[PDB]
């Protein structure tokens, strides 16, 4: 039957919302370009330049795509040979790295991080043979911490002329000083993923970026879809990336950080809450006493969180996205 | 260097506009959903149901994606094993079939059509070994003619339990009675590509569809991106696919067909115009005397067409998209 014609790997491979790391409030935007009958630019000029000014890079070092998710796929499609090359990631982390490789047909090499979520440098150096792309989320999802920049430098020296190192900075707006965007001059093999889905409050736009050196970007352009971005998305993205939009964005980051600190202080006092881990993002990882029990309870109360109990070493943990003061108080009361 | 890390195939692999088959006039649309902070549905309910009513299929037989282009890729990603499986197409036709396979790493089997653009059935039957997906554009781009339904039935009998047959109906709105959408009940391996880019006048939305049986659609869902469509695109798409939107669309089809007939009558009278081929779409293929000479001339006059002189058997031909009466008269006068 039809199913027998599909590739073997393809055969084998939810919706108070505080589970997807979205900004809790909707920032309104309206269209300004009524040119829907014509195909859009392959890489919207206004979007690429506005983002390059914001990120502090050159326009030729930016690539716009359908979220950071498409960015993850592009890197594998351009550098990894199916059945020959490997990808490497360090659990517990964002699940789309292995899903894309599994869907495409590339092998996964996993080197779990140390107990403090930091990189197991010696383990990575031992499993690099055959690896073409290394993904590192910093700050990490779901744990919330930054990877020591000194260890990142070591990772970069290890992969020079061997593999591409991709730093997922989907949550960098929360700790802007920790960005590796300035390292592009020093490292040809460094690529960074960015997005408008979190701090920018535009998850519905499906708009992301890849920051890398001209050489890498030019290669990715060869594997990307002819018109990866719609005109309405490029329209709103340029409005959100204007100087006033970047000011409003920072106001949002501020509000979330303040609220995050309140939520962390309150959670520590709660008995069932065994441990609250520090974060430099818009979510909090916390180990609970009988996590799935409390998860179901809140779930039945209309408080949607994200269970991480199945993740390597995240037994008993739930990931809570930071929302409004009313939503935080709602989770506090329920606990 | 960086380039040496890329896959071998990746290393090796323009903007009066009448060159992209777009509707000449912009139909205005405005947003109605200010929920941009939240991730969109993976498959927008309103879009899938409105399109299913229009196309006359069941909602479970529809898949919405970023244009018919993503639809072409999905089929190869789900059914073709890189380095093992093959794709088959019949030149001269739409160029994205071979580009997607070349980018992914799948081999192309080409069986050029007969002199009248119809399918070389015996040639296809001889090159089917190893083929997993067969693409057939009907009506064809750039020639404009329909593939004999009797030959399509033969193609379908030849591929039963061997390969998926995909009918590209990107231009079907111009000859709706010629659609193979009703054949889904009879053929499990039949898939159809649709789009909002032409008659629907929404090329800027990057919104397309794949019509197939539940089994095929469920497999494609496994290889597609988590949120392939943005909220603003799903918003406008549902507005355009409402009963009133389908009525307005048909008005557009009517206007284009009438204009097409005018443009064909006028072109025949012109001396340099050697031959004008009949079309069931929104473009016209025509063989000219010194085609690149006339192409450059019009190009220098701000009249942009599409050169097909390099396509197999399309030597001396230019593809002219049907626009407004003023644009047609502008091309007539220039000739
Ligand atoms: C680390 C990380 N990297 C990349 C992305 C991709 O973002 P985008 O630009 O939207 O493609 C995400 C979103 N992961 C969130 C997905 C939520 C959802 O799917 O819904 C998450 O983990 O909550 C990440 O958490
Ligand atoms: C036969 C055919 N099939 C599929 C598509 C894909 O459409 P979409 O839904 O937008 O992805 C196109 C557009 N081909 C036009 C592309 C114009 C452009 O790239 O610009 C064309 O040939 O003019 C086709 O001509």
Map A91-155 to HEC letters.
CCCCCHHHHHHHHHCCEEEECCCCCCCCCCHHHHHHCCCCEEEEEEECCCCCCCCCCCHHHHHHH
Measured CA angle at B37 (ends B36, B43), to 5 deg: 60
d(CA B63, CA B166): 14
Return the structure tokens found at B89: 């197409």
Residues B67 and B200 placed together within one structural domain of the fold: yes
Residue B276 lies in a domain: yes
d(CA B135, CA B193): 10
Q: Cis (ω within 30 of 0) for the bond into A139?
A: yes
d(CA B279, CA B329): 19
Residue B198 lies in a domain: yes
What angle, rounded to 10 degrees, do the helices at A67-79 and A214-223 form? 90
Return the structure tokens found at A9: 């790997």
| Other beta carbons within 10 Å of B27 | 17
Return the structure tokens found at A226: 């002819």
Do the Cβ atoms of B276 and B252 come closer than 8 Å?
A: no
Name the residue with tokens 């590192």. A136
Name the residue with tokens 């809790």. A24
Ligand at shortest distance from the CA of A89: 1
Q: Which domain holds residue A212?
A: 38-242
Buried b (16+ CB within 10 A) or exposed e, B50-88: bbbebbebeeebbbbbbbbbbbbbbbbbbbbbbeebbbb
Q: Cis (ω within 30 of 0) for the bond into A255?
A: no
Return the structure tokens found at B4: 């040496």
Residue A33 lies in a domain: no
Q: Which atom of ligand 2 is nearest to the CA of B70?
A: 11
With 0-12 / 13-18 / 19 or more C-beta atoms within 10 angstroms meaning exposed / middle / buried, residue A238 is buried
Would the CB atoms of A205 and B230 count as touching at under 8 Å? yes
CATH number of the domain encompassing residue A282: 3.90.1150.10
CATH number of the domain encompassing residue B149: 3.40.640.10
Return the structure tokens found at A283: 């979510």
Return the structure tokens found at B129: 């070994």
Please give the torsion angle defined by the CA atoms of residues A267, A268, A273 and A279, in that order, rounded to the nearest 10 degrees.
70
The single-letter DSSP state of residue A81 is P
d(CA B42, CA A295): 25
Ligand 2 mean position to A176 CA, how many Å?
41
Residue B2 lies in a domain: yes
d(CA A281, CA B235): 30
Q: Which of A242, A273, A302 is the last residue of a domain?
A: A242
Name the residue with tokens 């939305």. B205
Would the CB atoms of B225 and A69 count as touching at under 8 Å? yes
Residues B56 and B183 placed together within one structural domain of the fold: yes
- Measured CA to CA in angstroms, residue B245 lies from A192, B161, B252, B254 at distances of 42, 39, 11, 14
Radius of gyration of chain B (CA): 20
| H helix or E strand, kind and range, residue A239 | helix A231-240
Do the Cβ atoms of B289 and B312 come closer than 8 Å?
A: no
Buried b (16+ CB within 10 A) or exposed e, A239-269: bbbeeebbeebeebbebbbebbeebbebbee
- Measured CA to CA in angstroms, residue B264 lies from A314, B67, B322 at distances of 69, 29, 10
- Strand A273-276 relative to strand A208-211, pairing: unpaired
DSSP-derived 3-state class of residue A163: coil
Provide DSSP, A183-237: GGGT-TTEEEEEESSSTT--GGG--EEEE--HHHHHHHHHHS-SS-S-HHHHHHH
Measured CA angle at B20 (ends B16, B21), to 5 deg: 95
Give the strands of the sheet with B190-195, arranged side by side. Answer: B62-65, B208-211, B190-195, B164-168, B131-137, B86-89, B107-110
B150: Cβ contacts below 8 Å, ≥ 6 apart: none
Please say whether the dihedral angle defined by the alpha carbons of residues B158, B163, B164 and B170, taken in this order, is positive or negative: negative
Residues B185 and B268 placed together within one structural domain of the fold: no
Residues B107 and B168 placed together within one structural domain of the fold: yes
Name the residue with tokens 């469920």. B218
Q: What is the 3-state secondary structure (H, E, C) of chain B?
A: CHHHHCCHHHHHCCCCECCCCCCCCCCCCCCCCCCCCCCCCCCCHHHHHHHHHHHCCCHHHEEEECHHHHHHHHHHHHHCCCCCCEEEECCCCCCHHHHHHHHHCCEEEECCCCCCCCCCHHHHHHCCCCEEEEEEECCCCCCCCCCCHHHHHHHHHHHCCCCEEEEECCCHHHCHHHCCHHHHHCCCCEEEEEECCCCCCCHHHCCEEEECCHHHHHHHHHHCCCCCCCHHHHHHHHHHCCHHHHHHHHHHHHHHHHHHHHHHHHHHHCCCEEEECCCCCCEEEEEECCHHHHHHHHHHCCCECEECCCCCCCCCEEEEECCCHHHHHHHHHHC
Residues A145 and A190 placed together within one structural domain of the fold: yes
Please say whether the dihedral angle defined by the alpha carbons of residues B149, B151, B155 and B157, taken in this order, is positive or negative: positive
| H helix or E strand, kind and range, residue A64 | strand A62-65
Q: Quote the longest CA-to-CA distance of chain A.
A: 59
Do the Cβ atoms of A73 and A100 come closer than 8 Å?
A: yes
Residues A98 and A209 placed together within one structural domain of the fold: yes
H and E: helices and strands count for chain A? 11, 11
Residues A256 and A229 placed together within one structural domain of the fold: no
d(CA A20, CA B42): 14
Give the strands of the sheet with A273-276, arranged side by side. Answer: A273-276, A283-288, A317-321, A306-307
Ligand 1 mean position to A100 CA, how many Å?
13
With 0-12 / 13-18 / 19 or more C-beta atoms within 10 angstroms meaning exposed / middle / buried, residue B315 is exposed
Instruction: Return the residue in B4, B7, B70, B224 with the most chain A beta carbons within 10 A, the one to mutate for interface testing.
Output: B7
- Distance between B221 CA and the closest CA of chain A, angstroms: 10
Q: Which of A194, A210, A242 is the last residue of a domain?
A: A242
Name the residue with tokens 């094993």. B81
**What is the number of alpha carbons within 13 Å of residue B165 lying toward its C-beta?**
28
Q: Cis (ω within 30 of 0) for the bond into A142?
A: yes
Would the CB atoms of A78 and B6 count as touching at under 8 Å? yes
Experimental method: X-ray
d(CA B298, CA B142): 19
- Strand A306-307 relative to strand A107-110, pairing: unpaired
- Strand B190-195 relative to strand B164-168, pairing: parallel
DSSP-derived 3-state class of residue A54: helix
d(CA A242, CA A240): 6
Q: Cis (ω within 30 of 0) for the bond into A92?
A: yes
Give the strands of the sheet with A164-168, arranged side by side. Answer: A62-65, A208-211, A190-195, A164-168, A131-137, A86-89, A107-110
Residue B32 lies in a domain: no
Instruction: Return the residue in B19, B24, B34, B36 with the most chain A beta carbons within 10 A, the one to mutate for interface testing.
Output: B36
User: Residue with the nearest Cα to atom 15 of ligand 2?
Assistant: B20
Return the structure tokens found at A293: 């029990």
| H helix or E strand, kind and range, residue A310 | none
Residues B49 and B109 placed together within one structural domain of the fold: yes
Do the Cβ atoms of B25 and B219 come closer than 8 Å?
A: no
Buried b (16+ CB within 10 A) or exposed e, B252-272: bbebbbebbeebbebbeeeee
DSSP-derived 3-state class of residue A305: coil
Name the residue with tokens 């009703």. B182
For residue B7, report the phi and psi dihedrals to the nearest 5 degrees. Answer: -65, 145
Q: What is the resolution of this structure in A?
A: 2.3
In terms of Cα–Cα distance, which of B293, B242, B308 is closest to B93?
B308
Do the Cβ atoms of B79 and B164 come closer than 8 Å?
A: yes
Q: Which of B211, B242, B273 is the last residue of a domain?
A: B242
Do the Cβ atoms of A105 and B82 come closer than 8 Å?
A: yes
Residue B180 lies in a domain: yes
Please say whether the dihedral angle defined by the alpha carbons of residues B323, B326, B327 and B328, taken in this order, is positive or negative: positive
The single-letter DSSP state of residue A5 is G
- Measured CA to CA in angstroms, residue B140 lies from A260, B89, B93, B176 at distances of 57, 12, 6, 14
Residues B290 and B144 placed together within one structural domain of the fold: no
DSSP-derived 3-state class of residue A9: helix
B31: Cβ contacts below 8 Å, ≥ 6 apart: A29, A30, A31, A232, B232, B235, B236
- Distance between B168 CA and the closest CA of chain A, angstroms: 18
Residue B33 lies in a domain: no
Q: What's the domain count of chain B? A: 2
d(CA B12, CA A84): 18
End-to-end CA distance of chain B: 51
Return the structure tokens found at A218: 């030019």
Residues B216 and B251 placed together within one structural domain of the fold: no
Ligand at shortest distance from the CA of A140: 1
With 0-12 / 13-18 / 19 or more C-beta atoms within 10 angstroms meaning exposed / middle / buried, residue B183 is middle
Residues A203 and A86 placed together within one structural domain of the fold: yes
């Amino acid at each position: 039957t039809i199913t027998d014609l599909a590739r073997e790997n393809v055969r084998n491979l939810a919706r108070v919302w505080l589970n997807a790391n979205e900004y809790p409030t909707a920032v309104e935007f309206q269209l300004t370009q009524q040119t829907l009958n014509r195909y859009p630019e392959c890489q919207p000029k206004a979007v690429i330049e506005n983002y390059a000014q914001y990120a502090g890079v050159k326009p030729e070092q930016v690539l716009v795509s359908r979220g950071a998710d498409e960015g993850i796929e592009l890197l594998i499609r351009a550098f990894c040979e199916p059945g020959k090359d490997a990808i490497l990631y360090c659990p517990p982390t964002y699940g789309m790295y292995s899903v894309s490789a599994e869907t495409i047909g590339v092998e996964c090499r996993t080197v779990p991080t140390l107990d403090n979520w930091q990189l197991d440098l010696q383990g990575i150096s031992d499993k690099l043979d055959g690896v073409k792309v290394v993904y590192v989320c910093s700050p990490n999802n779901p744990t919330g911490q930054l990877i020591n920049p000194q260890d990142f430098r070591t990772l970069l020296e290890l992969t020079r002329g061997k593999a591409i190192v991709v730093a997922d900075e989907a949550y960098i707006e929360f700790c802007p000083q920790a960005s590796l965007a300035g390292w592009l001059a020093e490292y040809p093999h460094l690529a960074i993923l960015r997005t408008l889905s979190k701090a920018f409050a535009l998850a519905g736009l499906r708009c992301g970026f890849t920051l890398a050196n001209e050489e890498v970007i030019n290669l990715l352009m060869k594997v990307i879809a002819p018109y990866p971005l719609s005109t309405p998305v490029a329209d709103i993205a340029a409005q959100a990336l204007s100087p006033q939009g970047i000011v409003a964005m920072r106001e949002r980051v501020a509000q979330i950080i303040a609220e995050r600190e309140y939520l962390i202080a309150a959670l520590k006092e709660i008995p069932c809450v065994e441990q609250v881990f520090d974060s430099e993002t818009n979510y909090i990882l916390a180990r609970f006493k009988a996590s799935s029990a409390v998860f179901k309870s809140l779930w039945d109360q209309g408080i949607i969180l994200r269970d991480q109990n199945k993740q390597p070493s995240l037994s008993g943990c739930l990931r809570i996205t930071v929302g409004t003061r009313e939503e935080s108080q709602r989770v506090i009361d329920a606990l």
